[PDB]
Ligand binder design. Structure first.
Ligand code: MG
Length: 219
């Protein structure tokens, strides 16, 4: 059987998309840039903090120093961290808590493979820390997704090779990172975004222990 499951956070366990949006909108209002509405915010999902800020500045052809750029990015992050104080167990995606319970009762290892600097905090707020055997520290990896580094670290941290593991992801870059690690990917989303050479489910309610076992069998 597989010996471990390697979880992304955003888009698999939960999301904090409403909070990132309110933070960028508040920042744009403060500095007087029109146009940061829900539809525009779709261009910021999956994009780095610094690329997101540049896209906002480009709405007004605005030019800033390195020091001003750093301060704006810090203000947005400060507001984002204040707002995620209200994350709770209600924010866990459908199916995820049952999957965690079933993996733990079958002695299958569980690891977080997320780029979030707030990963341990968010798991504590959702009451999930007791299910996790390890959290890969994104500060200690050399390269981000689609590089495999974070998935290799997550598997190693629970004492397995990536070839013994399943990885769960909602992004094309994450799926590529899983493939290149040697783990088996199962995506959540649609093949237009994720590829059509991997198994995909439409939402997280479909991630059950029996479905993972069927996928591993067919491989
Ligand atoms: Mg994700």
């Amino acid at each position: 059987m597989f010996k471990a499951v390697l979880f992304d956070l955003d888009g698999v366990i939960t999301d904090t998309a409403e909070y990132h949006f309110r933070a960028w909108k508040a920042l744009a209002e403060e500095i007087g840039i029109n146009g940061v509405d829900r539809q525009f915010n779709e261009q910021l999902k999956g994009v780095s903090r610094e690329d997101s800020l540049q896209k906002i500045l480009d709405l007004a052809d605005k030019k800033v120093s390195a020091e001003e750029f750093k301060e704006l990015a810090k203000r947005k992050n400060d507001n984002y961290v204040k707002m995620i104080q209200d994350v709770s167990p209600a924010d866990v995606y459908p199916g995820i808590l049952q999957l965690l319970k079933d993996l733990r009762s079958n002695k299958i290892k569980i690891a977080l493979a997320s780029a979030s600097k707030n990963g341990p905090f968010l798991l504590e707020r959702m009451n999930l820390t007791g299910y996790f055997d390890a959290i890969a520290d994104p500060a200690e990896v050399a390269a981000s997704k689609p590089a495999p580094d974070i998935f290799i670290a997550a598997a190693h941290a629970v004492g397995v090779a990536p070839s013994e593991s399943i990885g769960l992801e909602d992004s094309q870059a994450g799926i590529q990172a899983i493939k290149d690690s040697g783990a088996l990917p199962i995506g959540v989303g649609r093949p237009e975004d994720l590829g059509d050479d991997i198994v995909i489910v439409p939402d997280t309610s479909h991630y059950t222990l029996e479905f993972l076992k069927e996928v591993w069998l067919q491989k």
